[PDB]
Amino acid sequence: LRADSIAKNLEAQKSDVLVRQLFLERATAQRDTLRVVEAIFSTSARYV
Amino acid sequence: NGTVEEIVEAYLQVQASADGFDPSEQAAYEAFEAARVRASQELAASAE
Numbered sequence: 001l002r003a004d005s006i007a008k009n010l011e012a013q014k015s016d017v018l019v020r021q022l023f024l025e026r027a028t029a030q031r032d033t034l035r036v037v038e039a040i041f042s043t044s045a046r047y048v
Numbered sequence: 049n050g051t052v053e054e055i056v057e058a059y060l061q062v063q064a065s066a067d068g069f070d071p072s073e074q075a076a077y078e079a080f081e082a083a084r085v086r087a088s089q090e091l092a093a094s095a096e
Contacts, residue, residue: 028071 059083 056062060079062069069075 024068031071 059086 050058060083065075065079
């Protein structure tokens, strides 16, 4: 039990889940801004 | 008597969803469909 506890508690300190959540949220904001920009460019191209 | 956070929590299973929130619109579609089916069964229960 002590061996397994040490092994898993050490591995659970390498990762920090809140940073990864922050990066997921930033990636979502990037995605929706990207589709807004793509719509802008496609609209301008069709207008011209 | 709940608030908005409680409402979204209870009727759409936020915690029971796949770990790492899927910002896909398909995920929202499935969540709302499940909520609809649950409400539909509750409606027949109240009818009886």
